[PDB]
Design a protein around this motif. Structure first.
Motif, short mmCIF file in Angstrom:
data_model
loop_
_atom_site.label_atom_id
_atom_site.label_comp_id
_atom_site.label_asym_id
_atom_site.label_seq_id
_atom_site.Cartn_x
_atom_site.Cartn_y
_atom_site.Cartn_z
N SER A 194 -14.94 31.25 3.65
CA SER A 194 -14.15 30.53 2.65
C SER A 194 -12.87 29.83 3.16
O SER A 194 -12.21 29.08 2.42
CB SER A 194 -13.79 31.49 1.51
OG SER A 194 -12.91 32.50 1.97
N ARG A 195 -12.47 30.09 4.40
CA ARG A 195 -11.30 29.40 4.91
C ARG A 195 -11.63 27.97 5.37
O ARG A 195 -10.84 27.06 5.17
CB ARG A 195 -10.67 30.17 6.08
CG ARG A 195 -9.58 29.38 6.79
CD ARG A 195 -8.53 30.30 7.31
NE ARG A 195 -8.08 31.15 6.21
CZ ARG A 195 -6.99 31.90 6.22
NH1 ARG A 195 -6.18 31.92 7.27
NH2 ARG A 195 -6.71 32.62 5.16
N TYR A 196 -12.82 27.76 5.93
CA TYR A 196 -13.16 26.43 6.44
C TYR A 196 -14.29 25.67 5.76
O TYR A 196 -14.28 24.44 5.76
CB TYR A 196 -13.54 26.55 7.93
CG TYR A 196 -12.52 27.30 8.74
CD1 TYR A 196 -12.70 28.65 9.05
CD2 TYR A 196 -11.35 26.68 9.16
CE1 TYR A 196 -11.73 29.35 9.77
CE2 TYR A 196 -10.38 27.37 9.87
CZ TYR A 196 -10.57 28.70 10.17
OH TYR A 196 -9.61 29.39 10.87
N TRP A 197 -15.21 26.39 5.13
CA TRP A 197 -16.39 25.75 4.59
C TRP A 197 -16.61 25.63 3.11
O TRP A 197 -17.13 24.61 2.65
CB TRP A 197 -17.62 26.42 5.22
CG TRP A 197 -17.52 26.45 6.72
CD1 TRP A 197 -17.23 27.53 7.51
CD2 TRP A 197 -17.64 25.33 7.61
NE1 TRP A 197 -17.15 27.15 8.83
CE2 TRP A 197 -17.40 25.80 8.92
CE3 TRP A 197 -17.93 23.97 7.42
CZ2 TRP A 197 -17.44 24.96 10.04
CZ3 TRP A 197 -17.96 23.13 8.54
CH2 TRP A 197 -17.71 23.63 9.83
N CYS A 198 -16.29 26.66 2.35
CA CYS A 198 -16.51 26.59 0.91
C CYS A 198 -15.25 27.05 0.20
O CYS A 198 -14.38 27.70 0.80
CB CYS A 198 -17.70 27.47 0.51
SG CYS A 198 -17.47 29.26 0.82
N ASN A 199 -15.12 26.65 -1.06
CA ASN A 199 -13.96 27.03 -1.86
C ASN A 199 -14.19 28.23 -2.76
O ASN A 199 -15.10 28.21 -3.59
CB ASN A 199 -13.53 25.88 -2.76
CG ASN A 199 -12.35 26.25 -3.65
OD1 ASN A 199 -11.35 26.79 -3.16
ND2 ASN A 199 -12.46 25.98 -4.95
N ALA A 231 -7.26 27.08 3.19
CA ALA A 231 -8.62 26.66 3.02
C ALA A 231 -8.87 25.16 3.09
O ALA A 231 -8.09 24.34 2.59
CB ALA A 231 -9.17 27.21 1.71
N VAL A 232 -9.90 24.82 3.84
CA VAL A 232 -10.39 23.47 3.92
C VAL A 232 -11.77 23.81 3.36
O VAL A 232 -12.24 24.96 3.43
CB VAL A 232 -10.37 22.86 5.35
CG1 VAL A 232 -8.99 23.00 5.94
CG2 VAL A 232 -11.39 23.48 6.24
N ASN A 233 -12.36 22.87 2.69
CA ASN A 233 -13.62 23.12 2.02
C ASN A 233 -14.52 22.07 2.61
O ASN A 233 -14.92 21.14 1.92
CB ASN A 233 -13.31 22.90 0.54
CG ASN A 233 -14.52 22.94 -0.34
OD1 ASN A 233 -15.56 23.51 0.01
ND2 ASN A 233 -14.38 22.34 -1.52
NA NA Z 1 -12.31 26.24 1.83
#
Ligand code: NA
Length: 130
Positions: A61-66, A73-75
């Motif tokens: 959830s930190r780099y890929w999904c919200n 977080a980057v989504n």
């Molecule tokens: Na994210």
């Protein structure tokens, strides 16, 4: 849900995973096995950075999904992490593909590096007729 081995292999193949970015179907299988035991509902919360790994591929959830609760977080998959907890893994597969288009490719997953990379993974697809 927990996929049975060949059931998942056939599903991933149908969803265009076999050979995606040079990643064989057996390697995707090995990744899913060590990350979640083929469980679409698996979640792993990391109290340190407050991020959580979601679903069959344990996407973070930190780099890929919200998940609306992870700092920094980057989504990158532009997707609610809830979509990664569905029995229907199409959303998860599309996100997994996005992950591996980055420079590291499938090496992004530490468990895959430790348990699958450079090793024989033919047992993951044997007998599945894939
Ligand atoms: Na994210």
């Amino acid at each position: 849900k927990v996929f049975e081995r060949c059931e998942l292999a056939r599903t991933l193949k149908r969803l265009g995973m076999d050979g995606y970015r040079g990643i064989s179907l057996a390697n995707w299988m090995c990744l899913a096995k060590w990350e979640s035991g083929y469980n679409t509902r698996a979640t792993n919360y990391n109290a340190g950075d407050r991020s959580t790994d979601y679903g069959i591929f344990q996407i973070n959830s930190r780099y890929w999904c919200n998940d609306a609760k992870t700092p920094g977080a980057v989504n990158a998959c532009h997707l609610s992490c809830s979509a990664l907890l569905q029995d229907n893994i199409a959303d998860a597969v599309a996100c997994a593909k996005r992950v591996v288009r980055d420079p590291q490719g499938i090496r992004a997953w530490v468990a895959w590096r430790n348990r699958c990379q450079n090793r024989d993974v033919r047992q993951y697809v044997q007998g599945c007729g894939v």
